[PDB]
Amino acid sequence: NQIDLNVTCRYAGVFHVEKNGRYSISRTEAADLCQAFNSTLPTMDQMKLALSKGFETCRYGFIEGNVVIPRIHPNAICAANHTGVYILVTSNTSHYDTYCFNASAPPEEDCTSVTDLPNSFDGPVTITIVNRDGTRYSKKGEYRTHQEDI
Ligand SMILES: COCC(COC)N1CCc2cccc(N)c2C1
Ligand SMILES: COCC(COC)N1CCc2cccc(N)c2C1
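== CD44 antigen ==
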């Protein structure tokens, strides 16, 4: 009973989280996941500011209201070569990665590791935070509050 949460650097408090390295987070799970990081789903304005500080990914993820990919450099296989905050328009499916926003983070690029999931609740799951540099922090707990997400 294990979950890996791969996390990025924060940019103006905004970061990306993927669960088990595949698109697998529902919209309800995304909100609960950010809550476990003492964070919220970013607004579009928060995401735009993060992009301006150097944030980009090649992954669809929830923000408040939309599913997006922040892009700085045009890449043909990431957001169909778009730059800016690319908004997903048409999809059949409901599960993506998520973005999260931590107001207490530094204002610009913070590429230090994440070493806590401060607002997880008690539970039976071994939850591992995996940083891009491989640094890992584990704890037993839970973050999902909706039965359909488990
Ligand atoms: C009825 O559901 C109780 C849930 C959710 O708490 C609101 N938790 C409660 C805390 C907890 C601790 C260790 C193992 C498990 N399974 C659980 C289950
Ligand atoms: C936005 O990045 C999504 C992808 C990048 O694929 C190379 N995953 C790749 C696997 C991984 C492992 C640990 C932390 C992070 N951030 C990541 C990021």
